[PDB]
Design a protein around this ligand. Sequence first.
Ligand SMILES: Cc1onc(C(=O)O)c1C[C@H](N)C(=O)O
Ligand SMILES: Cc1onc(C(=O)O)c1C[C@H](N)C(=O)O
Ligand SMILES: [Zn+2]
Ligand SMILES: [Zn+2]
Ligand SMILES: [Zn+2]
Ligand SMILES: [Zn+2]
Lengths: 258, 258
Amino acid sequence: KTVVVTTILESPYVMMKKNHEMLEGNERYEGYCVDLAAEIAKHCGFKYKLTIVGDGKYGARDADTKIWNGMVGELVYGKADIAIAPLTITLVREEVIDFSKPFMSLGISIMIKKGTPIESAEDLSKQTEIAYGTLDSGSTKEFFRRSKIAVFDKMWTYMRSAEPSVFVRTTAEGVARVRKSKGKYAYLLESTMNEYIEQRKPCDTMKVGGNLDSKGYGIATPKGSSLGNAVNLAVLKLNEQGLLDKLKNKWWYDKGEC
Amino acid sequence: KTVVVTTILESPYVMMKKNHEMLEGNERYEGYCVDLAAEIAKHCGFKYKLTIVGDGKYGARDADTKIWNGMVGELVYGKADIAIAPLTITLVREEVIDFSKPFMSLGISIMIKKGTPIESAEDLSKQTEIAYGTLDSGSTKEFFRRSKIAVFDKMWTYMRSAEPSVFVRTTAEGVARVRKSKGKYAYLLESTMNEYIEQRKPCDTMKVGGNLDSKGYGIATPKGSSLGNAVNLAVLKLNEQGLLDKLKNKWWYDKGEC
Ligand SMILES: Cc1onc(C(=O)O)c1C[C@H](N)C(=O)O
Ligand SMILES: Cc1onc(C(=O)O)c1C[C@H](N)C(=O)O
Ligand SMILES: [Zn+2]
Ligand SMILES: [Zn+2]
Ligand SMILES: [Zn+2]
Ligand SMILES: [Zn+2]
């Protein structure tokens, strides 16, 4: 009867507390999604267990086997009852799992090491000196793969064939790549994460230009799940009550170090 | 067979063509939602008829009769099969009708006549010289009435008791009131509309401060409607292909006058 929640270690959504080793169960974690999970569980009246997705991925379908990985896969194959994480609502995912209305609004953005001569996606697309990539098994990579927009189509063509690979396994890896590239690598990631990192030491990265698109994160459940309806209404109530905005300020700027 | 679409005459979403009198059916109208309706119908494979909501309202439930008015009412009582308009996804509405994922992201904002000494909601709430209101039967009015947030609570207490009434019947009425008030009336409306009006002559209004909240517009259908699934997937596909961004640029800035 305990709801199995699949989530991912991605700051500031879900992070291990400093003293996590002395703690047990859900108490080991903290963050925006940890707080959200507690609120959702309270309003929907259920007990839960936070579990970190096995493969550390958000979710994409293997082109050859057609098997889903990441948190999406855990929902699709019955390993988890709900995903509470910064998981983007997309067409390909909506076809296999259900999503609540968005609890956060965002868009793809460009992260650069401060000083990098780039101000837009068009800039990145018209040069080669600065390499750029995105997160593997994430919605941004899939967005570029499917976009028929001239600029993004050109960017995808470059990224998919780039050697060495410009893709990374985790957001952390992408950020580290930007910071150690001395400005020779730009990273495409959602504005939420870009803005968070810009507020973290060593304060050497920044979001440049506007967002490339507009999308949202939603709480996901297996298609047809009974929890779906209640969770959706809970998200709408939490947003209207200002709770979601309070959580973003709490985890993004109240704890900012820049 | 033919899907009855309820919508509202709200520029630039739906407007009467200059020569509408000499045109038939759907050809009489133009605008963002007219363009969107054609695309949604094409992608979902259905024929449709655009109809303007009888009472010219978005939708609220009367406190005494418990009867829903506006486009929400048209769906609730079976007068329309779908609503394609700048209709905000809200908890109270989601309890009686279904909504697709957002096709537009926005938030409540403040419109002032240029020169008005107001920079935020906090400013409005602490003074009385400048009156302020919002749209009747709209989601913004409902937001303020249900808000437990100190500042918004104070603002509702004022608006609810202000005499003469600070509420208006249509967005156009609110804008006209701001323009003829010599700066003594501020208007609370969604950022989308605020931004649009900011681009229309005589270019005497502007949006000030940040948005008060974060929400979205969704395509609505009667609760449990069979059209729901297809329409939602169509919205996601159209957003991912940049169609929604193209439509906003088309109707907001390409046709801008300021
Ligand atoms: C977080 C996060 O931050 N940036 C990304 C990205 O895919 O660029 C993601 C993953 C994405 N929300 C998804 O694949 O659901
Ligand atoms: C448009 C529009 O622009 N501003 C508003 C508002 O309620 O402030 C609205 C109506 C609202 N989207 C709704 O009640 O659905
Ligand atoms: Zn709560
Ligand atoms: Zn006319
Ligand atoms: Zn199309
Ligand atoms: Zn066609």
